[PDB]
Amino acid sequence: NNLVKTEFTNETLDKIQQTQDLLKKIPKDVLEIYSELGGEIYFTDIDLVEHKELQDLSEEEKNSMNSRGEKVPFASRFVFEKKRETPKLIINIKDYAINSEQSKEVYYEIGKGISLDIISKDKSLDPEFLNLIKSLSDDSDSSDLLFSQKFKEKLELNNKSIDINFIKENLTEFQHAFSLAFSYYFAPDHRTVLELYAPDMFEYMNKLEKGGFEKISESLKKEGVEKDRIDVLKGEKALKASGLVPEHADAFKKIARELNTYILFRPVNKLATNLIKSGVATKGLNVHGKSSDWGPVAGYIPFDQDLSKKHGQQLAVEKGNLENKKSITEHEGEIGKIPLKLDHLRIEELKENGIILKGKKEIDNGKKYYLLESNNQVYEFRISDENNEVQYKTKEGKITVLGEKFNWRNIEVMAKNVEGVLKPLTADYDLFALAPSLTEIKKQIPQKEWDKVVNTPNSLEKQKGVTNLLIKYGIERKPDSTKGTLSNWQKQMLDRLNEAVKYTGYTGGDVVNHGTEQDNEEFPEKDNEIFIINPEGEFILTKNWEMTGRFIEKNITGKDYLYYFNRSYNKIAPGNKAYIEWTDPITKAKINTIPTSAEFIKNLSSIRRSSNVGVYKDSGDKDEFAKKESVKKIAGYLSDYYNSANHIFSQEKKRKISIFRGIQAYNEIENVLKSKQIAPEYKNYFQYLKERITNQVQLLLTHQKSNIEFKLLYKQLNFTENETDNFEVFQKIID
Amino acid sequence: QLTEEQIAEFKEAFSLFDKDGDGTITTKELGTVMRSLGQNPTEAELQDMINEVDADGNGTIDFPEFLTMMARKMKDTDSEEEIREAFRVFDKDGNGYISAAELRHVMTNLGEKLTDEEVDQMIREADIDGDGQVNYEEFVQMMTAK
Ligand SMILES: Nc1ncnc2c1ncn2[C@@H]1O[C@@H]2COP(=O)(O)O[C@H]2[C@H]1O
Ligand SMILES: [Ca+2]
Ligand SMILES: [Ca+2]
Ligand SMILES: [Ca+2]
Ligand SMILES: [Mg+2]
């Protein structure tokens, strides 16, 4: 952010060496205080009047309190400040000299000072006692009742105790001061005047030069970032929508540090937030039931699907139960169903949250039953008293979407196997991704392998070797018998999380059961809010899919942390057939990149399966052949662009040699586009393959000599019967 | 288990270089069919594949002969991806290109002290079109190019 602008490089050093002789006197930092306020100083040649390209009608002269004293004759002026948003100081210089009666440059000083007062310390932080009491040195501290040079028409009021009683009313008059105190301190001539006459303001300024200007220059700098940043509610406000069990979140807070890796989680249902702390197990991969958001079962995975979110979809349930059944049908012993038993706290909870209403009692067979009411219109519920079991039944005037009707039964929830005990199941913590410090991965490669790699000669191969290491130990993802598809360190991380939330007091085992959602290629889900946990211990919950993608670019991606985004982002995911967008830089640069032989063949191979007609047909027409022969020609040219022996050449040639290879392609393309009846499907693609080449070829130009345009450069070539000297022609086209 | 779509290509390409329009490609042709598709079998590694099934003029290979031979080294390989992720990693700033600045940068965090002289060096040998930087294409080339 360059501060000073010099309009007319018209005079010689006389003008230049005068604007310098000017700024070299103002304290560097007082400038950094300016640039921070987004200011910019304008020095011009002979623009006095409203002639500067920024001296027209915005926030001009409202109320007349102008120079040191008061004059308001704008016209004659040479120094001005656009007061309202981003300060703009404008200065013009004429002939040789400011140094005779420096009483002129002083205004480029105070005229300036009006930049930092009202924003300086006088009031940004507020008038703080510092200047609030220092202004009070009107006449009470030191035996120097000399303030004649800053307090006249607005403070000749020697009869008033100027504390907080009356200094607010006129913030402005106490600026005309700090300003004249500044102009007086830095004025090239009168320096002691503020030492002889004002005894403190002097010290005041001096302290400021001593390090005060840097004070605020660093308090505006810090609020430079904290100001404009990514709105994520940090602190515990996140942990609120986080759903994670506080003691756990806090528990995790410690792992992110030691290991140094962001932990990113997806929204964990709140109606589970406690079922966990409580001690309930977590849904792993083996279960695909739906949870519930109502009734007593809510927070649990009913075995009875019709007692979950999909209450009515006579198929989400008819193909929903069909799910739990198999969940056991297969993994029996580990996955089963057990009767519901809402404990004490839980009840009181689903209460003020409004899911159930505990009321009137009843009696059957001799046992007590408190009645549990839920404004549903098909199931009536009741908990027990001995063992707090729970029960439901179809009402005497309703049926089940599948066509069932029954009397009181025990509500069954799903339950995995925990240390030989079928504990019930509630939501698990699903990790959105794990970002480990790019260095933490090095602390993953066995000291000899990473060694045997760097102790290599080939500068090029010493990279490939590294990258593969980074890949083998960091990016690679193998599948898994139990924990989904995840990295290796990802598993190790996945352990430390579980063992961490265990020395805390959890009794349901693990609370993170599988790899990171950025591998859920099959049925990927787009969560808006995402709780994160930087390698320090701060809980940050984003709010957008963008913000989220934005917070990763800023703090993870571009901050030395290894992150990798879902393979199925930008494509349609097979399972749920979904398209989730995510800024891929490679794609960014595709627009200006000449395609590859194979990238090309591929695209043809595609449109074939689309319009059931390929670029060239298997026929007798000799034009079809022509076309064929032709694409086999571009297939080359492209493949020729990307030649590995382009290395024994000089950066220079590489561009030339390739711009041609490029162009050659743009030709045989230009040839077919003007062919026989190649369908439009292909007419289009080619239409597109051109813009690429073109751009790629344009780019290779603006790297070296850029007055030349593709369109033209092309014209000047001759691709008819002899290519020989054409290349020779090309060379001379760039000189 | 090549996906159907994985056939479209292995043919749309196989055929393009089948000059004599039949359904069998000569050795040199197979060599070309592949390179075009993004590989390159060595001068001698190129035979072992065409050699194993001599039910032709003792030198050619048809459509199936081909498709069925794109397993020997294609029913395992899934590296393609990793490398595209390794790229996004060094391409620190997200311009789609890998500048000598970032190479050296990510090179050191990963623990390698590289000389300013031998980075402006890799970036060079990796660059094919001469624009001072390595895009995904040249990267992939450099990486897999054995
Ligand atoms: N290795 C994995 N990492 C992340 N998500 C996975 C993994 N394997 C499977 N998933 C899916 O992530 C899905 C998100 O919620 P579900 O528990 O309903 O079902 C989960 C699985 O289908
Ligand atoms: Ca043939
Ligand atoms: Ca880059
Ligand atoms: Ca390049
Ligand atoms: Mg899960």
Structural notes for this entry:
The complex is a heterodimer of chains A (735) and B (146). Chain A is an alpha+beta fold. Helices cover 37% and strands 11% of the residues of chain A. Chain B folds into 2 domains: 16-76, Recoverin, domain 1 (Orthogonal Bundle), CATH 1.10.238.10; 77-146, Orthogonal Bundle (Recoverin, domain 1). Chain B is elongated and about 55 Å long. Chain B has a two-stranded antiparallel ribbon. Chain B is 45% helix and 5% strand. Chain B has helices at residues 5-12, 27-37, 45-51, 64-67, 79-90, 100-109, 122-126, 136-144; strands at residues 25-26, 60-61, 97-98, 134-135. In chain B, helix 5 (79-90) packs across helix 8 (136-144). Chain B has 146 residues and is mainly α. Chains A and B meet through helix 13, helix 15, helix 18, helix 19 and helix 20 of A and helix 1, helix 2, helix 5, helix 6 and helix 7 of B. The structure holds adenosine-3',5'-cyclic-monophosphate (CMP), calcium ion (3 copies) and magnesium ion.
Features:
heterodimer; A: 735 residues; alpha+beta; Collagenase (Catalytic Domain); Adenylylcyclase toxin fold; five-stranded antiparallel sheet; four-stranded mixed sheet; 37% helix; flat; B: 146 residues; mainly alpha; Recoverin, domain 1; 2 domains; two-stranded antiparallel sheet; two-stranded antiparallel ribbon; 5% strand; elongated; binds adenosine-3',5'-cyclic-monophosphate; binds calcium ion; binds magnesium ion; adenylate cyclase activity (chain A); magnesium (chain A)
